[PDB]
Structure formats: C-alpha cells, structure tokens
Design a protein around this nucleic acid. Structure first.
Lengths: 68, 82, 71, 200, 86
RNA sequence: GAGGGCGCUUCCUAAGGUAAGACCGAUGACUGGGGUGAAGUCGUAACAAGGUAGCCGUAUCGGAAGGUGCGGCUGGAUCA
RNA sequence: UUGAGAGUUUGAUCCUGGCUCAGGACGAACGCUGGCGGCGUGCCUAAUACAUGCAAGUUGAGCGAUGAAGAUUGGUGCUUGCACCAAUUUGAAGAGCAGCGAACGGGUGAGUAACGCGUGGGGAAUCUGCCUUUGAGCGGGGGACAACAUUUGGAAACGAAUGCUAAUACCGCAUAAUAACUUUAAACAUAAGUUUUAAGUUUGAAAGAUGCAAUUGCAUCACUCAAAGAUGAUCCCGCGUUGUAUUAGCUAGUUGGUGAGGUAAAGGCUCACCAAGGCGAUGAUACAUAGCCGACCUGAGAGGGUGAUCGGCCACAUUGGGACUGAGACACGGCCCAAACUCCUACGGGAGGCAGCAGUAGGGAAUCUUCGGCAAUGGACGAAAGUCUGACCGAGCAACGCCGCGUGAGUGAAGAAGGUUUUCGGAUCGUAAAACUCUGUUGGUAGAGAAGAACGUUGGUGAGAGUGGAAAGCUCAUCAAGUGACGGUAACUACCCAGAAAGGGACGGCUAACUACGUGCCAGCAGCCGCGGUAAUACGUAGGUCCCGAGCGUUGUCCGGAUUUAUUGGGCGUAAAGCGAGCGCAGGUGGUUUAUUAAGUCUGGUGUAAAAGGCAGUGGCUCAACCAUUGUAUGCAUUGGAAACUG
C-alpha cells in the first residue's frame, strides 16, 4: 500500500498461485475472525485458476462454466 | 430615486456618507420564524446633518463613489438625541 | 493563422500609426480661446474619419475638459 | 424463457390460465423431495407464491412485469387493484386464449408471435401488444391453415366473456374488460404489490 | 442581426425541426430567445405549428427566415401581407 | 513649419534574486503513553460490611495493584 | 402525500442504545453467460505530453497579373495548311492589394467561496455594425504602395534596396447643424436635478458596384448617422448561493473630500492633493475546499445527495503578464514579452502548443474510429452561383444502460429408457416431454421492391411597389428544376428445418430452495448470528431445488430505513446528559384594555424555468421503452383590500 496502510488483505479459497511483483486486485471485504484486516483480495481474477462446478457460482476462485 | 430602506445609523461622523441598520425579519427554513438581520448601507449626506436617532432614506441612482451605493438623500424620520 | 496575421499587422500598424497621428493632435494643447483652434481641438475626433475611429461618446468625454474652458 | 411448470404445476398443484391444465399425479417437486414430505410458507411465502402464480403462470418476464407493473401502479384512485388485474387481459395471446382457440397463452404467443396472424396491417412480433377495447383482430388465412393451428387453435372450443368470437375467421373484439367481478384467482395487491412495488 | 431558423430534434431516422427566432450569434441547438412553432416536413406530411403573430413582431423588428421557413411564409400569406404593407 | 517612425528618459512593470519569517506536509537517532496478543512473573485488591465499603476533588509516599491525610456523598453495609 | 425489518450485550425481560441488512440509482469494474433489433449513453480519470488528419473564409459585380484562348484573322510555312504571324478574351488556380466573421462553431472545469451563480430593478452611469429602417449625399483632390518591377542577404527562418499601378484602400479639405458643445429663456426639475426652443462649431462616400435603359432616370450596399425598434452586451444594488472563531482584532488608497485622466458611463474606475477613518466577535480578514444554477438519483414527503451527459451563465486556453486592432478579445487555432519543453541549426538564428473533433503515448474501472458528406440544417462571406463547418447529420466501438421478442409451440406423463435418492417402493423429464402434429419471433436463402428522409435559391409565367418608368431589377402568389450517407435501408413475399440462437446467481438461518456428501475446528465458507473437531441443508461435493435473465452475482459510491441531531420527527433523576452557584450585557419572550398602523399576517393584479422536466393527452422508431407534440401544473414577482392576532 503506497498510502502507508496495512500489509495484509485476505486471500479466499484453497491455495494461490501468485508471488512477489504480481498485480493484486483489492476486494472491499471484512472478516471479524481475521484480525488486523480492512480489505480482502479478489480471487477469481485475471491471475487466478481454480476448479469449477462449485456449489457457489461455479466460477469464482479462478473458474468458469466448464467447457466440458 | 425608487427604493427605500430604514434604520438608525452606526456612525454619524463621516462626510457625504452614513450607514443604516436593518430590521428585516427573514425566514429560517427549519425554525420557521423570520429573524431580524442588520445590513449596512453607507451613502449620501447632504450637508452632513448627522444626528443620533434620525433615519435617512435611500435613492436607487448612480452610486456616489466607492462603497456609497445609494444616495441616502431624504431624512424622513427625525428623532432627538435623548 | 492563414492570413489573419496580416489582418493583425496591417490594421494595427496602419491605424496605430494613425494614433501616432492622433497623440499630438490631442496634445500640443494651449488654452487658446480661438474659434479655429477649437475647430482643431474639436476636430480631433474627425481628422481621418474612416480610420479615424470616430467613436461613440468619445467626442463627448473629450468635450468634458475640452468644453470645460475650451479656451 | 420457455421454462417448465414444476413450480406452477407442483409447488401450487395448479397451473392456472396462462396454461390452464391441472397436472396429473405426483404433485410434489420430484427427483429429490418427490417421495418426501411437504413444507410451509409465510406472508413472504405467499407474496412469493402469488407473484409467481400470477407472473410465472402466464409467460410474463419480471423485467417487463415489474416495469409495466409500476406502470400498473400509476394512478391513485383508491383501490388500484382493478387497474392491476384489468391489465391481465390486455396481452393479445390472452385475448385469443379467452377466445378459447389456443390451448395456452404460450400457443397464441407462439403462433401469433411468428407473424402468422396479421393484426391490422402489422407482422405481429409482440403478442403482449397492449389491447384497447372495441377493436377487431384481423387473422390471416395462412395462419388459419397452419396445421398446428388446424390441430389445436383452429380446433375450436368455448369462449369467455368480454369479446366477440368470430369462429369462422377465428377473431375477437374486446367488448368490456374482465375484472375482479370476472376473473378470480387469489389476486392480492399486498402480495404482489407489496412483494415488488417498494415492499411496503 | 436577427434570424428565424429550424431546430433539429428527433431520432436517427425521424428528425423533427422546431422553428425558433434567432440571430447570427444564436446557437441553433443551445442558447435561444423563444421558439415559434414545431415543424416536420415529410411526415405526415407538411406538419407545422403556426401562429403568424410573433413572426410579424420580429419582422416589424426584422428577422431572417430559413429555406422552408421563408417558403412556409409564402405558404402563410404574410409575405403577401408585406405586399399589403407595401 | 505642424505632424510622423526613429530620435529619447521616466512611470507601472511579467519573470528571477534577496531576507525573516509564519503555515502545512514529509521526514527522524532515541523516547512517552495507549491498544493487541501468552497461557511468564509481582500482588491483593474492585466486586458480598469482597475481605480496611467506598466514590470524588486535592496534597503526598509507594515496583505495581495501591496506601496516608484534608473535606464531602451514598452510586454503603449489621443496621447504627 | 405516506411508513415492515432482520440478527445482535439475551441466565431471562424491557428500555436507553449502537452495530447488521433488504430496496433503488450508477459516465463503474470484475468471475460467468455474452442472441437479435430499436432507443440512448460512455477519460467521472494526469487543465499529462503530443508525430497523425480535419477544424473560417469569401468574392475576378474594384484591381494588378501568368496561363489558356491560340479568343487562329493577320506569310495564318507549305508539313498539303498551320512550326508560326500566335485577333484579344471563356481573360486559366485566374495568385496578391479590399471585406467579413476573426469574439463563429467547439470543448475543459484548472482555478474561482463572491455582484461569479439564479431571481428583481436601473441606466437619474450605457454601447450595439451585422436586421427592420429616418433625414441622407453617394463632395473633394492628392500620394507611396501589396502584385509587378525587382537587386539581394540569409543554413533556413525571414526580410531589405527598387519605382509604379489598383482600390469594392487611405488622406487633407468647403458640403453634415437636433450627434457634442458653443446659446439665450425656462414649462419641468429630484441631494444630485431632468426636460423645449430662443446664438455660434467639427466633418461624407465604393461621384462606387453590377447593370438597366430611358418623363435618362430605377434597384444591393459604407463612411452621410440617425429616427427609433430590435438584438447582443456594460456595470451597480436586493435576494440565497462551503467548512475551519484551536478561522482576532483587521484594514494604507484603507475611507471620505477636491481636482484631473479614463470609460460606453457616476464611480480611488484610476491618479494627484487634503482630510482618519472604516470593518470586526450577531464572524472581518487568513486557511482548506468549490465552477454555479435549472436540473437529476434516493427518500412517502420533510428531505438527503449529485451537478453527470442536456441547457444557461461564469472561467480558461503549456505557464505568467501586457497591449493594438476590431462596434465588440486582452483573443483554442491574434500579436509582444518572459519561462518550460521540443525541432532544425554550419550554433551566427528560427518555430510551436489537441482542456476543438479525431487519434497517439502516458494512468486507471474508463476505447467511442486516426470513416463519408454538408443535401437534413447552422454560420461565414459572395449580387447570385459558389465556397468552406471533425458543428451537425450519419456509419462503425462498448450488454455500458433502457425496452422488446426469442431460441420452440400444441397433443400425448407412464415415473417413464434416463439420472439421483433409496427403509429397495417411490421419484426427476411437467407438457419439445421418449415419441407425434405443425411453425417461422430473431436469424436461412431468393430476393420483388429497395424509405418519404427533399425546401428553393436556378429559369419561365402571372400579381404588387407598379418602382418620372412598362423597362430591367426588387417584392414573393405559379410551374420546370437537383434535392442522398446510412441503400436495394427498417418494412414485404417466397420461411428454411425445430432445426442456427437462454444462462447466471442462490439453498444453516438472516427471506422462501435439503439429502448423497470426503470431511473432522481439516481445508474452507460468510454482511450479522456464525461456523467445520465423524455422518455439516453452512464447507468440497452430486442431485433436487429458490430467484432472475441476455443478463446474473460481487464489491466501489449515495439515498432510505436511521426519529442515528429527533422543525416535521428527541432526551437530560439513575441508563449520555442541569453549568459549581449568583449577576443582569446583549438577545429572547411578553398583565389587561382604547384607537391607529398593515410592517408581518390573508385576498386580488404583476414577475416564473426560452427550454428540457412532472399531471394528463396525442402521434410515433411500431405497440414497445421512450421520443416528438400539446396544454396543465410554480415566494421566482409587485400591487388594491382586511384591523382578527402579533409588531
């Protein structure tokens, strides 16, 4: 954060592919169970893969409608 | 020539200029009661006939010079100092 | 920026040069209660008359002082 | 669009006169929870239930429904519910459906939507054309000899109120308009209007 | 100094003019004085709102009609009324 | 000769320098408090008349809960 | 002209009370899905920087003047006509001197916190070509000069010597005086004062223009300049137009007076001189922040909130500052200066600013395309013709929004083959269903047509002024005459096969939609309560379901609920709270009654957004949505009455 704020925001889902020097989208999200946060991270983004047919929307966390 | 205002002067000392108090009660949109407000208008003195208590009246005309917007020509109300 | 530079310089040059031919026409001003001298000083608005810029109320404001003891 | 009616046919047991057919046995939602037991509802559940029976029985969409249903919530003449349910017949497939020719409103919407029946000089591509009373409905003879229409729609049947039924030319003219005195399912402005129109 | 013109007001293929007395300086879609009449030539057809009064006011003051506006005044007889004042 | 550009100094004068600030941000060795997390360790307090009931404003002595005292009130008791 | 809550300190309740959330709107993005057509809209973003096009010309009805004519006659050679003598004009773009908008059109909100914005008055502060149109002549001569002679310089840039034309240039100078003043009287006249006539002043032209023809005079225009209207401006004032008094004393031309310069004008508008005030604790200055308004999203309204896009005003033009011209600019595409970039430089010099439309590079959520023409207007000149216009009209990009239809319909349902659960039954497919009968929404193809996108300026006829004059021309009452870009454009026939054309979110509740289900407080899910530690409707997981759709859902913003600043529509004993108590400053409130007053208060006339927008109606891209229209609806204001209340 270039504006002197938290070096944290939550990565949802199991696992992640990113590393240092990766552009990271910024969900506006809060979890009471997760201390010291203000923001979350948009998983299910341009830099995100996953496994589809999820029982919630099939397409977050890096997924689509399954092309078979 | 046209319009009119009314009120006591603050400073009855200056030359060819004198102000006026304003009573005007204008509305507060929340509270509803129209509230007094005192605008000031420094303008003409004829012979500098300045007295505590009197009221001069304006003229919508050429302004005299800087800050002298009307010509306070006619002293319609005349009081006596105490 | 096509020919309007010429529209600026030929006009500004020509009638500003007329204004050079108007400065001491206004001035070199003695009192001179003379009919012809006040035909000069009164004529100052009307000395070129098409590039003389005979202007609205300019003769009148130039007749406040001029008429105000023109001589 | 063109979805089934396990909701109308099963979650109410009544596919009303957008289709009209009472369905057969096994009135639950089948597959899972078909051999299983019942459920319950609430005032939300019958706001829900009434908007889905009146909306989803017919063939209406919700975009067109709630937009033209605020446009049924226009005036303030006391009980607006006459102006609500009065605009249940003013779609043309419902008009032919109350001529009794088409089996469902979806059939007259199909074969009126195809540009078969040319209602007064226009290739009809909206069967929710907003109907004005006292006007005729011109029906093309090609449509009158469509074999799906010859099978069901030209296969004549009884006829409702409020129109004139040209059995020879399969036409109609809206005489009066049906209303709460005429049509009666459990229509409630609290349920549908207080489900949609600024829930209230 | 003073003119009288149309007003482009319509669809991609259904325009609709609206006659407004104007100037050489006047924006024909923006700043105006006051429109006089609403016009549609070829639908359906020769459609116009006319009052034939404020055109006489701004011809007492003197304005400039447009093509179909001037020809509309020849289709209004007020130019023959200028023969009458003549 | 008049007048004229140039001839011809000044006025205002855009910018740049000067000085002595003030404002506001960034920034900072070390450092005061506060919050968070351990579940170390010190302690009996505050809670029952909670183990000297307190609770204030104030002075003053403690590692610390805290104490001593000035005066006041129950948001205090056995019931005085 | 209206009104729900949820889950939450809950050992148990109420109340104070916060936290939770549904609904809608977005110049939004994102995972998915992306059908079509119509209607719209789209750097909110770095006033960042710009190779890349276009953005304002005009006329030969003034003028110079090359070229074509050979305006082929002149030896028109003898080539059997022409190399030419080349007859003087279609004289060729017919360059460049002249006029016009140059201030259009168009953006961009950087700044700007109040005469800027939006109302009302006034020129007793004023201007106004371009239009309507009044008197009104188109006097009067002269002279350098663009171009052309033309010699040069210079790397270019850019000039210079050099004489002369032309003027639809200039200029003296009588002729123009109600213009301004010079006068003499005053009806009037208001602190200033305004207003009719009573004596003297400046100076005009394109003697032009095309022509016409003639009672030899008639049309388009500039100065003659008024005679007004009209337009578009000028400044002053009333009104409301952000927060910080941890934003206190502030102010030096400051504030008055006189004079002068200016101006279109009163005006420290300036400046000189002489006076010392004035503001301000009922917010002046200083700092942050802001383009403003009509309007518009939400709220039942009260309102909150925004200023997008549209329209108006204001402001700006890399930055800063001047100033000429121009009727009007301190001027996106004027100048000059500086600075900052950049380019060329042989280093001696020159040149420019996309906050114009495009488009490029920046930076993101944020590309409209480096497309056509101006017919459909709009403006500019031009007698007209004509000309140009990245204005506009259109086409193409964006599901970025709004609408509208749809991918099948009808019969036929058995649990049917089929999936899954399964206590082994039952159950999906719910009216294509497994079949059957057909059909052309949108698209298949053949395409008939192909959307009117359209008015006369150009010529004729005829009428009027009938223009000493019919001429000619002008007014404008007719016909002929092109009115293209979406174009074979929407629409329509032949309609092809059900065949080409529906997915997204959600299921612990919180609000409707739970069992197979690895799990085992594990991984993960979540706005709140939360969960998951062995069979979790929370999760991964399949099936069934719950809501929607070419859009779903997610967060980013805002409104509501929230009465959660409670005027409408609070509380103060303990739950947050009465100063630690007195005065007697403002300020607030007023025992009774008589009368005036109408100030406020109610009634009537007057202003009111050009508009656009609501309440209705009409037509229509069908009908849709929404557009076009038509009214209605308004402190926008000023003026008569009312003494019932207050003052």
């Amino acid at each position: 954060l270039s504006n002197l704020m938290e070096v944290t925001a939550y990565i949802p889902g199991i696992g992640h592919n990113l590393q240092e020097h990766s552009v990271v989208l910024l969900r506006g999200g809060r979890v009471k169970d997760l201390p010291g946060v203000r923001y979350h991270i948009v998983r299910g983004a341009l830099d995100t893969a996953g496994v589809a047919d999820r029982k919630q929307s099939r397409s977050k966390y890096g997924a689509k409608k399954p092309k078979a | 020539q046209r319009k009119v205002y009314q009120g006591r002067v603050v400073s009855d000392k200056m030359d060819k200029t004198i102000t006026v108090v304003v009573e005007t009660k204008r509305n507060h949109p929340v509270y509803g009661k129209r509230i007094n407000y005192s605008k000031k208008y420094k303008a003409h003195d004829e012979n500098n006939s300045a007295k505590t208590g009197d009221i001069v009246r304006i003229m919508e005309t050429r302004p005299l010079s800087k800050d002298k917007h009307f010509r306070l020509v006619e002293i319609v109300e005349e009081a006596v100092i105490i | 920026a096509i020919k309007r530079a010429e529209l600026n310089k030929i006009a500004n040059e020509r009638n500003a040069q007329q204004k050079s031919a108007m400065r001491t026409l206004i001035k070199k001003f003695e009192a001179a209660p003379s009919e012809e001298l006040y035909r000069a000083a009164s004529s100052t608005i009307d000395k070129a008359a098409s590039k003389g810029l005979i202007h609205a109320n300019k003769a009148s404001r130039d007749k406040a002082r001029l008429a105000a003891k023109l001589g | 669009y063109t979805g089934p009616s396990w909701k109308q046919s099963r979650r109410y047991g009544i596919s009303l006169t957008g289709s009209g057919k009472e369905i057969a046995r096994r009135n639950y939602v089948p597959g899972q929870h078909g051999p299983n037991n019942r459920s319950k509802l609430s005032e939300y559940g019958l706001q829900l239930a009434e908007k889905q029976k009146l909306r989803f029985t017919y063939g209406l969409s919700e975009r067109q429904f709630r937009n033209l249903y605020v446009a049924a919530t226009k005036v303030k003449e006391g009980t607006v519910g006459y102006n609500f349910m009065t605009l249940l017949e003013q779609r043309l497939d419902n008009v032919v459906y109350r001529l009794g020719l088409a089996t469902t409103r979806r059939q007259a919407r199909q074969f009126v939507n195809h540009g078969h029946i040319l209602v007064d000089g226009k290739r009809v591509d909206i069967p929710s054309f907003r109907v004005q009373p006292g006007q005729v409905i011109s029906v093309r003879e090609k449509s009158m000899k469509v074999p799906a229409i010859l099978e069901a729609v030209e296969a004549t049947k009884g006829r409702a109120n409020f129109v004139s039924f040209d059995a020879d030319k399969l036409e109609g003219t809206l005489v009066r308009l049906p209303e709460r005195d005429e049509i009666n399912p459990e229509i409630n402005d609290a349920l549908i209007v207080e489900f949609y129109n600024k829930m209230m | 100094s003073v003119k009288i013109r149309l007003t482009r007001m319509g669809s991609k293929k259904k325009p609709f003019y609206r006659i407004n007395v104007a100037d050489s300086r006047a924006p024909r879609d923006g700043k105006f004085i006051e429109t006089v009449g609403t016009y549609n030539p070829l639908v359906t057809e020769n459609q116009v709102t006319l009052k034939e009064e404020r055109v006489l006011e701004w011809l007492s003051n003197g304005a400039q009609p447009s093509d179909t506006v001037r020809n509309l005044l020849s289709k209004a007889g007020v130019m023959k009324k200028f023969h009458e004042s003549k």
